[PDB]
Amino acid sequence: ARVAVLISGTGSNLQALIDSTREPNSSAQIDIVISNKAAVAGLDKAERAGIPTRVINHKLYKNRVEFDSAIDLVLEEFSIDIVCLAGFMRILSGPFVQKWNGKMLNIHPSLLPSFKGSNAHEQALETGVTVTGCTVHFVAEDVDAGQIILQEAVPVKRGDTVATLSERVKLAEHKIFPAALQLVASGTVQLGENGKICWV
Ligand SMILES: Nc1nc2[nH]c(CCCCc3cc(C(=O)N[C@@H](CCC(=O)O)C(=O)O)cs3)cc2c(=O)[nH]1
Numbered sequence: 105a106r107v108a109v110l111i112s113g114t115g116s117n118l119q120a121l122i123d124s125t126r127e128p129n130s131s132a133q134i135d136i137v138i139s140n141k142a143a144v145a146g147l148d149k150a151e152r153a154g155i156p157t158r159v160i161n162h163k164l165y166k167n168r169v170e171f172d173s174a175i176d177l178v179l180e181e182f183s184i185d186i187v188c189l190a191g192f193m194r195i196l197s198g199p200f201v202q203k204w205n206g207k208m209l210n211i212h213p214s215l216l217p218s219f220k221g222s223n224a225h226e227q228a229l230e231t232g233v234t235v236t237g238c239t240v241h242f243v244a245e246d247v248d249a250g251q252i253i254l255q256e257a258v259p260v261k262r263g264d265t266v267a268t269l270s271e272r273v274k275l276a277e278h279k280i281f282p283a284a285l286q287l288v289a290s291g292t293v294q295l296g297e298n299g300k301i302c303w304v
């Protein structure tokens with residue numbers, strides 16, 4: 105399966121996907137990395153790995169639909185089968201999401217359905233949970249509501265900050281994102297016609 109990884113920043117999840125997809129038994133290959141932001145570290149990681157990069161500045165488009173259309177053009181250019189959102193921080197339009205339904209994965213740094221949104225660690229810390237975690241899910245139009253593929257719990261330690269908690273949770277993200285990608289790319293897991301996860 106041919107994979108695009110979309111990023112907005114550091115790219116530690118991208119690096120874990122690069123590492124995993126290069127193992128001999130990987131059913132996935134990363135053929136393109138797309139960033140909505142220029143000069144971010146994830147682009148360095150991609151180039152260093154010899155993977156093509158494209159920057160699609162969302163700041164240059166009239167609306168969300170036109171921006172997503174620009175992404176989709178690149179996806180078609182590289183004959184992509186599966187899209188991974190790896191620290192990509194844009195909400196995607198309905199039509200784009202529906203086109204890639206069952207073929208697009210996202211990593212989220214909470215145990216969904218808790219703490220949806222862009223500041224999950226802040227929320228977890230404010231709420232006072234002692235267990236948080238991360239989630240890989242299929243992307244549906246409703247943000248962070250798509251079908252869950254894998255999750256891993258991570259303890260919150262007393263005195264944790266966003267800095268220390270995100271660091272601990274990223275270790276788990278780097279485990280379950282590659283595992284989830286391999287499940288989907290191998291055809292082991294798919295989105296069911298009833299819209300529920302199907303383990304083949
Ligand atoms: N339809 C849909 N789109 C998705 N994008 C992502 C990927 C995860 C998105 C995380 C989140 C970003 C924002 C947000 O408000 N983003 C801003 C951009 C602000 C910025 O540039 O930092 C926006 O898009 O207007 C809220 S949660 C997941 C996901 C999803 O499940 N469904």
Ligand SMILES: NCC(=O)N[C@@H]1O[C@H](COP(=O)([O-])[O-])[C@@H](O)[C@H]1O
Nearest residue numbers: 113114115116117190191211212213
């Ligand atoms: N709602 C999406 C979200 O919060 N994504 C989070 O951004 C970080 C990106 O790190 P990375 O650039 O090192 O992969 C990751 O922790 C990811 O879960």
